[PDB]
mmCIF file of C-alpha atoms in Angstrom:
data_model
loop_
_atom_site.group_PDB
_atom_site.id
_atom_site.type_symbol
_atom_site.label_atom_id
_atom_site.label_comp_id
_atom_site.label_asym_id
_atom_site.label_seq_id
_atom_site.Cartn_x
_atom_site.Cartn_y
_atom_site.Cartn_z
ATOM 1 C CA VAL A 1 0.000 0.000 0.000
ATOM 2 C CA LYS A 2 0.969 3.658 -0.325
ATOM 3 C CA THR A 3 -2.120 5.842 0.174
ATOM 4 C CA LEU A 4 -5.464 4.817 1.691
ATOM 5 C CA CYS A 5 -8.309 7.272 1.007
ATOM 6 C CA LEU A 6 -11.304 6.188 3.094
ATOM 7 C CA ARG A 7 -13.051 9.481 2.338
ATOM 8 C CA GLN A 8 -16.806 9.939 2.915
ATOM 9 C CA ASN A 9 -17.847 6.872 4.895
ATOM 10 C CA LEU A 10 -19.738 6.082 8.116
ATOM 11 C CA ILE A 11 -16.641 5.206 10.147
ATOM 12 C CA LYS A 12 -17.192 5.832 13.859
ATOM 13 C CA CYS A 13 -14.065 4.097 15.219
ATOM 14 C CA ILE A 14 -10.543 3.482 13.910
ATOM 15 C CA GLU A 15 -9.686 -0.237 13.767
ATOM 16 C CA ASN A 16 -8.434 -3.029 11.430
ATOM 17 C CA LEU A 17 -5.695 -0.810 9.945
ATOM 18 C CA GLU A 18 -2.804 -2.856 11.346
ATOM 19 C CA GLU A 19 -1.612 -5.144 8.537
ATOM 20 C CA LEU A 20 -0.500 -2.205 6.354
ATOM 21 C CA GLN A 21 2.976 -1.072 7.441
ATOM 22 C CA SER A 22 4.179 0.775 4.310
ATOM 23 C CA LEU A 23 1.316 3.306 4.317
ATOM 24 C CA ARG A 24 2.549 6.873 3.795
ATOM 25 C CA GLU A 25 -0.774 8.764 3.700
ATOM 26 C CA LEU A 26 -4.053 8.065 5.502
ATOM 27 C CA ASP A 27 -7.159 10.032 4.504
ATOM 28 C CA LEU A 28 -10.214 9.811 6.776
ATOM 29 C CA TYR A 29 -11.947 12.941 5.508
ATOM 30 C CA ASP A 30 -15.657 13.441 6.278
ATOM 31 C CA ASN A 31 -16.436 10.556 8.608
ATOM 32 C CA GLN A 32 -17.997 10.195 12.075
ATOM 33 C CA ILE A 33 -14.811 9.350 13.986
ATOM 34 C CA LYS A 34 -14.912 10.424 17.636
ATOM 35 C CA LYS A 35 -11.454 9.379 18.878
ATOM 36 C CA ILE A 36 -7.999 8.936 17.362
ATOM 37 C CA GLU A 37 -6.668 5.498 18.278
ATOM 38 C CA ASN A 38 -5.005 2.392 16.829
ATOM 39 C CA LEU A 39 -2.715 4.630 14.739
ATOM 40 C CA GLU A 40 0.554 4.004 16.617
ATOM 41 C CA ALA A 41 1.545 1.235 14.178
ATOM 42 C CA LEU A 42 1.774 3.553 11.128
ATOM 43 C CA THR A 43 5.257 4.788 11.943
ATOM 44 C CA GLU A 44 6.324 5.859 8.430
ATOM 45 C CA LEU A 45 3.087 7.805 7.853
ATOM 46 C CA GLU A 46 3.802 11.235 6.359
ATOM 47 C CA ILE A 47 0.288 12.692 5.897
ATOM 48 C CA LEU A 48 -2.689 12.210 8.235
ATOM 49 C CA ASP A 49 -6.066 13.753 7.362
ATOM 50 C CA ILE A 50 -8.854 13.273 9.912
ATOM 51 C CA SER A 51 -10.711 16.410 8.851
ATOM 52 C CA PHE A 52 -14.484 16.877 9.169
ATOM 53 C CA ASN A 53 -15.020 14.362 11.958
ATOM 54 C CA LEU A 54 -16.239 14.427 15.572
ATOM 55 C CA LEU A 55 -12.829 14.644 17.255
ATOM 56 C CA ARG A 56 -12.741 16.586 20.527
ATOM 57 C CA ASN A 57 -9.137 15.887 21.577
ATOM 58 C CA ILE A 58 -5.812 15.319 19.831
ATOM 59 C CA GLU A 59 -4.266 11.998 20.856
ATOM 60 C CA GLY A 60 -2.937 8.741 19.449
ATOM 61 C CA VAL A 61 -0.364 10.453 17.203
ATOM 62 C CA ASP A 62 2.542 10.151 19.660
ATOM 63 C CA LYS A 63 4.407 7.614 17.505
ATOM 64 C CA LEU A 64 4.004 9.235 14.054
ATOM 65 C CA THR A 65 7.426 10.873 14.229
ATOM 66 C CA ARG A 66 7.624 11.190 10.417
ATOM 67 C CA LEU A 67 4.416 13.210 9.957
ATOM 68 C CA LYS A 68 4.855 16.090 7.500
ATOM 69 C CA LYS A 69 1.245 17.291 7.076
ATOM 70 C CA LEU A 70 -1.615 17.002 9.580
ATOM 71 C CA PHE A 71 -5.155 17.930 8.489
ATOM 72 C CA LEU A 72 -7.676 18.244 11.341
ATOM 73 C CA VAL A 73 -10.029 20.819 9.821
ATOM 74 C CA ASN A 74 -13.603 21.071 11.126
ATOM 75 C CA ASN A 75 -13.728 19.082 14.368
ATOM 76 C CA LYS A 76 -14.607 19.787 18.011
ATOM 77 C CA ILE A 77 -11.017 20.157 19.226
ATOM 78 C CA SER A 78 -10.832 22.385 22.306
ATOM 79 C CA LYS A 79 -7.113 22.309 23.191
ATOM 80 C CA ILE A 80 -3.869 21.868 21.257
ATOM 81 C CA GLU A 81 -1.875 18.998 22.747
ATOM 82 C CA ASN A 82 -0.102 15.695 22.093
ATOM 83 C CA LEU A 83 1.873 16.958 19.087
ATOM 84 C CA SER A 84 5.300 17.369 20.710
ATOM 85 C CA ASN A 85 6.885 14.317 19.050
ATOM 86 C CA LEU A 86 6.067 15.499 15.497
ATOM 87 C CA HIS A 87 9.369 17.233 14.808
ATOM 88 C CA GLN A 88 9.088 16.756 11.033
ATOM 89 C CA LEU A 89 5.666 18.438 10.903
ATOM 90 C CA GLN A 90 5.639 21.156 8.236
ATOM 91 C CA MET A 91 1.912 21.868 7.802
ATOM 92 C CA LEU A 92 -0.662 21.961 10.604
ATOM 93 C CA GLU A 93 -4.317 22.513 9.702
ATOM 94 C CA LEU A 94 -6.630 23.158 12.669
ATOM 95 C CA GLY A 95 -9.303 25.314 11.055
ATOM 96 C CA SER A 96 -12.964 25.341 12.065
ATOM 97 C CA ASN A 97 -12.399 24.076 15.603
ATOM 98 C CA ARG A 98 -13.107 25.175 19.192
ATOM 99 C CA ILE A 99 -9.586 26.119 20.297
ATOM 100 C CA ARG A 100 -9.312 29.069 22.685
ATOM 101 C CA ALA A 101 -5.522 29.404 23.150
ATOM 102 C CA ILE A 102 -2.295 28.723 21.257
ATOM 103 C CA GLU A 103 -0.223 26.257 23.277
ATOM 104 C CA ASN A 104 2.108 23.274 23.105
ATOM 105 C CA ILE A 105 3.451 23.903 19.584
ATOM 106 C CA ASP A 106 6.891 25.245 20.559
ATOM 107 C CA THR A 107 8.401 21.841 19.695
ATOM 108 C CA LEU A 108 7.348 22.128 16.022
ATOM 109 C CA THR A 109 10.291 24.189 14.813
ATOM 110 C CA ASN A 110 9.971 22.841 11.249
ATOM 111 C CA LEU A 111 6.430 24.205 10.851
ATOM 112 C CA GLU A 112 6.106 26.139 7.595
ATOM 113 C CA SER A 113 2.297 26.509 7.656
ATOM 114 C CA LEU A 114 -0.069 27.057 10.592
ATOM 115 C CA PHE A 115 -3.829 27.344 10.026
ATOM 116 C CA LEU A 116 -6.105 28.208 12.964
ATOM 117 C CA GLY A 117 -9.039 29.895 11.251
ATOM 118 C CA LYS A 118 -12.630 29.818 12.487
ATOM 119 C CA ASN A 119 -11.663 29.185 16.107
ATOM 120 C CA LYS A 120 -11.972 31.122 19.386
ATOM 121 C CA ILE A 121 -8.357 32.166 20.036
ATOM 122 C CA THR A 122 -8.214 35.501 21.880
ATOM 123 C CA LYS A 123 -4.472 36.274 22.005
ATOM 124 C CA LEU A 124 -1.509 35.746 19.677
ATOM 125 C CA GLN A 125 1.120 33.995 21.798
ATOM 126 C CA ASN A 126 3.406 30.960 22.051
ATOM 127 C CA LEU A 127 4.569 31.346 18.432
ATOM 128 C CA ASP A 128 8.119 32.406 19.363
ATOM 129 C CA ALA A 129 9.701 29.054 18.449
ATOM 130 C CA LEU A 130 8.370 28.717 14.875
ATOM 131 C CA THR A 131 11.129 30.631 13.110
ATOM 132 C CA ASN A 132 10.546 28.628 9.904
ATOM 133 C CA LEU A 133 6.882 29.674 9.759
ATOM 134 C CA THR A 134 5.979 30.943 6.282
ATOM 135 C CA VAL A 135 2.155 30.997 6.436
ATOM 136 C CA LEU A 136 0.008 31.851 9.466
ATOM 137 C CA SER A 137 -3.795 31.933 9.293
ATOM 138 C CA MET A 138 -5.649 33.369 12.299
ATOM 139 C CA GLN A 139 -8.838 34.454 10.556
ATOM 140 C CA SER A 140 -12.338 34.417 12.078
ATOM 141 C CA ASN A 141 -10.938 34.350 15.628
ATOM 142 C CA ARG A 142 -11.259 36.546 18.744
ATOM 143 C CA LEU A 143 -8.024 38.478 18.150
ATOM 144 C CA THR A 144 -7.969 42.074 19.395
ATOM 145 C CA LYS A 145 -4.260 42.970 19.122
ATOM 146 C CA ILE A 146 -1.476 41.998 16.721
ATOM 147 C CA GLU A 147 1.449 40.665 18.755
ATOM 148 C CA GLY A 148 3.629 37.614 19.269
ATOM 149 C CA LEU A 149 4.938 37.788 15.688
ATOM 150 C CA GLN A 150 8.398 39.180 16.546
ATOM 151 C CA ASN A 151 10.147 35.856 15.828
ATOM 152 C CA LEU A 152 8.349 34.977 12.571
ATOM 153 C CA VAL A 153 11.066 36.484 10.413
ATOM 154 C CA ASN A 154 10.365 34.254 7.390
ATOM 155 C CA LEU A 155 6.618 34.920 7.577
ATOM 156 C CA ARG A 156 5.408 35.591 4.030
ATOM 157 C CA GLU A 157 1.624 35.111 4.393
ATOM 158 C CA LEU A 158 -0.439 36.400 7.330
ATOM 159 C CA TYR A 159 -4.248 36.219 7.420
ATOM 160 C CA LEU A 160 -6.077 38.056 10.218
ATOM 161 C CA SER A 161 -9.523 38.512 8.668
ATOM 162 C CA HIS A 162 -12.660 38.815 10.819
ATOM 163 C CA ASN A 163 -11.256 39.809 14.197
ATOM 164 C CA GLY A 164 -11.422 42.794 16.526
ATOM 165 C CA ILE A 165 -8.090 44.353 15.596
ATOM 166 C CA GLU A 166 -8.164 48.146 15.875
ATOM 167 C CA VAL A 167 -4.489 49.063 15.283
ATOM 168 C CA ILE A 168 -1.893 47.713 12.854
ATOM 169 C CA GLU A 169 1.281 46.953 14.819
ATOM 170 C CA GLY A 170 3.551 44.116 15.890
ATOM 171 C CA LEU A 171 4.730 43.591 12.292
ATOM 172 C CA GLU A 172 8.235 44.956 12.918
ATOM 173 C CA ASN A 173 10.281 41.837 12.155
ATOM 174 C CA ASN A 174 8.051 40.364 9.428
ATOM 175 C CA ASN A 175 9.797 41.994 6.481
ATOM 176 C CA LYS A 176 9.326 39.040 4.105
ATOM 177 C CA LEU A 177 5.528 39.494 4.139
ATOM 178 C CA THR A 178 4.062 39.135 0.649
ATOM 179 C CA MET A 179 0.383 38.611 1.551
ATOM 180 C CA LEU A 180 -1.171 40.531 4.450
ATOM 181 C CA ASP A 181 -4.907 40.097 5.074
ATOM 182 C CA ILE A 182 -6.387 42.160 7.911
ATOM 183 C CA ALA A 183 -9.801 42.718 6.350
ATOM 184 C CA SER A 184 -13.058 42.824 8.334
ATOM 185 C CA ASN A 185 -11.632 44.387 11.490
ATOM 186 C CA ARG A 186 -11.941 47.781 13.208
ATOM 187 C CA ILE A 187 -8.785 49.382 11.794
ATOM 188 C CA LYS A 188 -9.013 53.157 11.345
ATOM 189 C CA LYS A 189 -5.481 53.961 10.131
ATOM 190 C CA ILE A 190 -2.786 52.206 8.110
ATOM 191 C CA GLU A 191 0.403 52.336 10.184
ATOM 192 C CA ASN A 192 3.699 50.547 10.755
ATOM 193 C CA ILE A 193 3.804 48.712 7.413
ATOM 194 C CA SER A 194 6.202 51.017 5.561
ATOM 195 C CA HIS A 195 8.988 48.473 6.131
ATOM 196 C CA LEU A 196 6.936 45.777 4.345
ATOM 197 C CA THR A 197 8.573 46.227 0.954
ATOM 198 C CA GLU A 198 7.822 42.761 -0.460
ATOM 199 C CA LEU A 199 4.038 43.062 -0.061
ATOM 200 C CA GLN A 200 2.211 41.827 -3.165
ATOM 201 C CA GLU A 201 -1.419 41.497 -2.030
ATOM 202 C CA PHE A 202 -2.977 43.499 0.804
ATOM 203 C CA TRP A 203 -6.595 43.050 1.918
ATOM 204 C CA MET A 204 -8.083 45.813 4.078
ATOM 205 C CA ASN A 205 -11.747 45.758 3.092
ATOM 206 C CA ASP A 206 -14.514 46.150 5.689
ATOM 207 C CA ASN A 207 -12.590 48.398 8.083
ATOM 208 C CA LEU A 208 -12.854 52.063 9.122
ATOM 209 C CA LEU A 209 -10.167 53.695 6.973
ATOM 210 C CA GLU A 210 -10.773 57.443 6.631
ATOM 211 C CA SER A 211 -7.704 59.410 5.523
ATOM 212 C CA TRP A 212 -6.241 59.012 2.038
ATOM 213 C CA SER A 213 -2.782 59.914 3.373
ATOM 214 C CA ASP A 214 -2.501 56.398 4.829
ATOM 215 C CA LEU A 215 -1.635 55.034 1.374
ATOM 216 C CA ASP A 216 1.810 56.604 1.870
ATOM 217 C CA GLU A 217 2.684 53.554 3.986
ATOM 218 C CA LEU A 218 2.313 51.283 0.943
ATOM 219 C CA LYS A 219 4.639 53.362 -1.266
ATOM 220 C CA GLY A 220 7.646 51.151 -0.496
ATOM 221 C CA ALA A 221 6.060 47.971 -1.889
ATOM 222 C CA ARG A 222 7.120 48.199 -5.524
ATOM 223 C CA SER A 223 5.798 44.678 -6.203
ATOM 224 C CA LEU A 224 2.354 45.447 -4.744
ATOM 225 C CA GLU A 225 -0.001 43.966 -7.350
ATOM 226 C CA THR A 226 -3.397 43.655 -5.618
ATOM 227 C CA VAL A 227 -5.041 45.790 -2.926
ATOM 228 C CA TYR A 228 -8.526 45.529 -1.397
ATOM 229 C CA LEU A 229 -9.968 48.662 0.215
ATOM 230 C CA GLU A 230 -13.707 48.379 -0.504
ATOM 231 C CA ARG A 231 -16.404 48.850 2.162
ATOM 232 C CA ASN A 232 -14.148 51.361 3.893
ATOM 233 C CA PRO A 233 -15.156 55.008 4.350
ATOM 234 C CA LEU A 234 -12.611 55.617 1.563
ATOM 235 C CA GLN A 235 -15.064 54.231 -1.007
ATOM 236 C CA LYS A 236 -17.405 57.172 -0.341
ATOM 237 C CA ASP A 237 -14.938 59.230 -2.382
ATOM 238 C CA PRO A 238 -16.164 59.336 -6.012
ATOM 239 C CA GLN A 239 -12.563 58.977 -7.266
ATOM 240 C CA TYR A 240 -11.837 56.116 -4.855
ATOM 241 C CA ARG A 241 -10.447 53.793 -7.532
ATOM 242 C CA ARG A 242 -8.354 56.492 -9.223
ATOM 243 C CA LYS A 243 -6.986 57.793 -5.909
ATOM 244 C CA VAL A 244 -5.803 54.292 -5.007
ATOM 245 C CA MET A 245 -4.480 53.972 -8.569
ATOM 246 C CA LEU A 246 -2.424 57.175 -8.370
ATOM 247 C CA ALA A 247 -1.080 56.569 -4.853
ATOM 248 C CA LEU A 248 -0.198 52.930 -5.624
ATOM 249 C CA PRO A 249 0.980 52.839 -9.261
ATOM 250 C CA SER A 250 2.321 49.269 -9.076
ATOM 251 C CA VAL A 251 -1.050 47.639 -8.338
ATOM 252 C CA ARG A 252 -2.934 46.064 -11.246
ATOM 253 C CA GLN A 253 -6.135 45.201 -9.360
ATOM 254 C CA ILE A 254 -8.185 47.300 -6.939
ATOM 255 C CA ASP A 255 -10.924 45.295 -5.196
ATOM 256 C CA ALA A 256 -12.425 43.036 -7.920
ATOM 257 C CA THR A 257 -11.524 45.323 -10.847
ATOM 258 C CA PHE A 258 -8.317 45.415 -12.869
ATOM 259 C CA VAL A 259 -6.523 48.604 -13.857
#
């Protein structure tokens, strides 16, 4: 065997998966599993996908030391735990869960992607050890302040949509940012992003932006190709598209319209 895809079944318990030792990828997407167990024997497994299930806790993956990707999207997981042995983990997908705090991931120094969207996290913390982190998704959470990103120096994609962020800050050491998404917040002013020179796409729709002089912060991004500013108070200006066009000459797309 090499890849078992038991997608879309009525599985409620994990069993009779012991004879297969050479399995590298197990896919249990969209089932009714309630507990992770009987998986310790798949030691050379590189990809585990138990997304869209009824999991409430993370367990039974203590022995999968060779895991590279872990998909646990859409479950009932309340706390992040029992992942400390997965040193080779590069991608961690925990979207659409019930997590309230970022914890117990400091041992995953080889993480390149971290997805925690549609959860209940209230504070950005405990990310200081993921210096290899390239993508971080914290959208549709309870975030109120941007912080804890001072050690994500290779961060190139940051998604903070649908939160309660009021001020743009904490992005001092994230100079490699190419995609910054802070749309659907309570931001009133664009600040502290003038050092983000490699920005390509920048979503800031559904905020409270008022002054046109904030676009001076984006002048350093010569590769800025796409910018979203709709549903801001800036759109009340009848030359909203042209004003963005003139201030940001490098962009080829404003909202859903090309230039």
